[PDB]
Structure formats: structure tokens, C-alpha cells
Amino acid sequence: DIVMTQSPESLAVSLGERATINCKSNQSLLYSSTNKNYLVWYLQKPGQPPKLLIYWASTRESGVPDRFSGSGSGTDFTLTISSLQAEDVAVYYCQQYYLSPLTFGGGTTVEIKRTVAAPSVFIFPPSDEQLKSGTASVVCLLNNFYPREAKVQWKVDNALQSGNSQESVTEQDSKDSTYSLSSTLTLSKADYEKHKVYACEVTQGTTSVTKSFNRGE
Amino acid sequence: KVQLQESGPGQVKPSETLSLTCSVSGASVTVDYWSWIRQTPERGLEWIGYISYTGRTNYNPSLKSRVTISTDTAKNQVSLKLSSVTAADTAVYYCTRDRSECPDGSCFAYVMAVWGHGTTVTVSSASTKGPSVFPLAPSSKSTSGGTAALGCLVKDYFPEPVTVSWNSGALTSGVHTFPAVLQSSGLYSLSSVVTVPSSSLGTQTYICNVNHKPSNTKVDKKVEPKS
Amino acid sequence: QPADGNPDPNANPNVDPN
């Protein structure tokens, strides 16, 4: 099978800067009879299928903005985004449509570098509805922050917790280029009801912010 | 536009046959080429095979022995059957409309021009289970300068996926629906949140609409402010 | 996939053979 390799695997550039993604094959994709390279570029945003950008290596599909262009020949191809826009953050894939079986590159994640933005931090006690059933989920929300890297810790009556939380993080937002993150602490009802102070501590760089609530207050 | 829509079972049990259908609008299955693709985090995108306008099928050797692709011209549909499934066949499955290039008396395909929305297929011996939905209630007092966050916690479902909307799609600004996590119990959980004006909590209804197609379950939960 | 060398005949769509 033809092997397709992309480089870099991830990149991040400021709004309006140039972004380039390389795709290499281990067999020339040039078909001499038509003098075309059978190389396709797609992008994929979360919850959505891949969407066509470029085919025959350099022909742009209708409806795609002008800032997307493809170049290259043989085994070495490049997608250029001349001026990266916030809505362009996505995973980009190359594909050879030259020799069966058809094969794809492994994707390149394209992200925007923007200014630091501190999260808005919210903390949710478990609902009374949930507590009726024996488990308490306490949720900490970090809304619309940058960069993605953050340390989120839970304290219960000032006891640092370990092993009983899970985190989930969104893709980069297509408008404001931020991330959001949830951390969910799972406790038994009995454990929840015997402690008072619940705190989520978020650390990035030189700042820690702790948001708390007192059970029953 | 051209619109492709895949239909599938959600979960299939090990060693069964997976059957999928692709419903096509704005194009004829009698023309050009139609592929099936699948996607996973670990393997990326994998082409399964195609069928051409002559009926010729072309399958990936990684799967040839287990795959059938066919078209039904009367229904304008493309189908996929995959036998003897295992966990390695869990994936999002897509059908695609692939264009043709015919230099002189003969054609081949060159692009996957339009993809369907995809259908998520989990191969598991576990039992399908719909979600419990709990409110993430906003406090009637704001401690964030007049903005309020609220949401729904969608707990203990299997398999993926769940989709969430708010107010039947009328509320999209400020919504964040997080990727699900696999809990230590082997069931999935996710939350969906939205930030809104705290001044709206008394008068604007907020309902999360949770769809779990694998269990044929929908849940609508009105999220009320807490006193 | 032009390099497969098994192109389909240019009868796209199939029409009444008559």
C-alpha cells in the first residue's frame, strides 16, 4: 500500500500568519497519461465529517476560501493557508487517490496562538436528584481560556483528592480560539454528606484560582 | 446540495454482521463511485472499499474477505455489510460520493467529494444502556458578575454517542458540549454547559435535549435555577 | 485510482443496452 506521512503532526500560529502542512508518499502520485498528481486535502472539525479542500494536488474545490492552496508533485506535497483564520482550526488530512487501496495521512492538527485568557471558573454541587441514588458528581467548569494546559485539583475539607476525578477538554473554539474544560469529582453520597468544603483549584503559570462551595449553604 | 446519510445499528455484538445503509440525495447512485470509510482515534481514516457505476467492487485487502458493498438503484442507496465483527471494527463509518475522470473511453475516481454525516458503530458484548440526565443548576445568585453557567450531566450510558442540543437548537451561543469520558464503571459520561445572562434565569426556559440513538432514548431536561 | 490500470468503460451511467 502507499504510505502517506504528514509533518508536523500539530502546529499553531497567530491569527493571520501562514501555516504549512507537508504530506509525503512513498510512491510517486503523478499519472503520466494525465500529468496530474492524485493527491487530495481534507479538513475535519469536531462532530463533522472531513470536507474537501484541494484535489489533483492543487485544484481548489468550489466554496473553499482563497487562503487555502496546494502545491507539490511526485511524492512531496504542501497545503498552505496563507493567513490563518480562527474558523480554520481543524485536523487536516492528505489522501492519495492514485493506487488501491486508497490511503490517508495521519492528520495534522492546526491551532491558533492567541493571547492568554484566564478561565471563568464555575463549580456545581451534585443535584439532589442524583444524590437520591447513592453517588455525588461535583463538576468544575473552566470556561473559555487559553492556553489549553492547566492543572486542576480538587480539595475536600482541604484534603487534596487523588484518583477520583476525570477531565474533559473541548476543541479550540472556532470564534474566540479558546478552550473549555470540565473536571468531575465522583464521590459516594455518604462521603459527600460527611464533608463541608468542596474546592476546585486551577493553576496556570503564576496564578492559581480556587473556587469553592460549602455543602448545604 | 448533494447529501449522504448513513444509517446503522449503534451497537453490534461480536461475530455478528454489521449492515449499514447510505441514503443519497442530489446525486444518483448509478453515476461515478461510492466509497465507505471508517475512522478511529488510533488508526485514523481507513478506506474500506468502493463500488463503481458498472457494479465493479474494489475492497481494501485489510478487509476484502469480510466486506460487501452494493447499490440499490430503486432506493438510490449504497450499502455495506461487514461480517464476523470484532472490537477492531468499532469506528465511525462514512459513505462518500467519489467523482470520476475519464481521459478517453475509460474512467477512474480521483476524489471523495462529499461525505455523509457518519454513523458510530461499537462492537461490544456489553448491554446497551440509555443515559441518566442530571441538572447542573445555576444558582439564582450570580458570583460571576451577572453571567450564569448551567448545564446537564449525561451519565452512565453505553455505547457512544450522545448528542446534546439546547432549546431544540435555538440556543447555540456559549454552549460547550464536552467529549465523553469512559468511567471506571465502563459506562460513558459527558456534560453540556452554557453561559447565559443571570437576569434571564427567572423568565427564560433552558432545556437540554439529549439523544442516545443506540438505545433509542431521548431525554429532555428543564434546568431550573436553585434558590 | 488511475494507477490500478483497470479503468471502467466510459458508460457512466449504464444506459438501456437497447
Domain spans in chain B, listed from the N-terminal domain onward: 3-123, 132-222
Domain with A143, as residue range(s), is 120-214
CATH of the domain at A136: 2.60.40.10
Burial class (CB in 10 A: 0-12, 13-18, 19+), B163: middle
Q: Is B27 on the interface with C (CB under 8 A)?
A: no
Same domain, yes or no: A135 and A154: yes
Domain total for chain A? 2
Record: fold of B3-123 = Immunoglobulin-like (2.60.40)
How far apart are the C-alpha atoms of A98 and B111, rounded to whole Å?
10
Distance CA B164, CA B213 (A): 12
Measure the CA–CA gap between B50 and B112, rounded to whole angstroms.
11
Domain match, A210 and A175 both: yes
Residue of chain B with shortest Cα separation from C3: B108
Grid cell of C3 as nine digits:
494507477
Mutation choice for C interface testing from A26, A34, A100, A104 by most C CBs within 10 A: A100
> What are the DSSP calls for A58-78, one per residue?
TEEPTTS-TTEEEEEETTEEE
Q: How far is C15 from chain A (nearest CA, A)?
A: 27
Q: B178 and A180: CB-CB below 8 Å?
A: yes
Give chain A positions within 8 Å (CB) of B183: 166, 186
Of A51, A126, A139, the CB nearest to B191: A139
CATH 1.20.1560.10 fits B132-222, yes or no: no
Method of elucidation = X-ray
Interchain contact, B53 vs C7, CB within 8 Å: no
Looking at the structure, tell me whether residues A131 and A61 fall in a common domain.
no
- What whole-number distance in Å separates Cα of residue A141 and Cα of residue B153? 12
Of A113, A134, A149, which one is at a domain's C-terminal end?
A113
Determine the distance from the C-alpha atom of residue B166 to the mean position of all C-alpha atoms in its chain, rounded to a whole number. Answer: 18
Chains touching chain B through at least 3 C-beta pairs below 8 angstroms are A, C
Domain end call among A113, A137, A158: A113
CB A40 within 8 A of CB A70: no
Residues from chain C contacting residue B51 (CB–CB below 8 Å): none
Omega of the bond prior to A50 within 30 degrees of 0, cis?
no
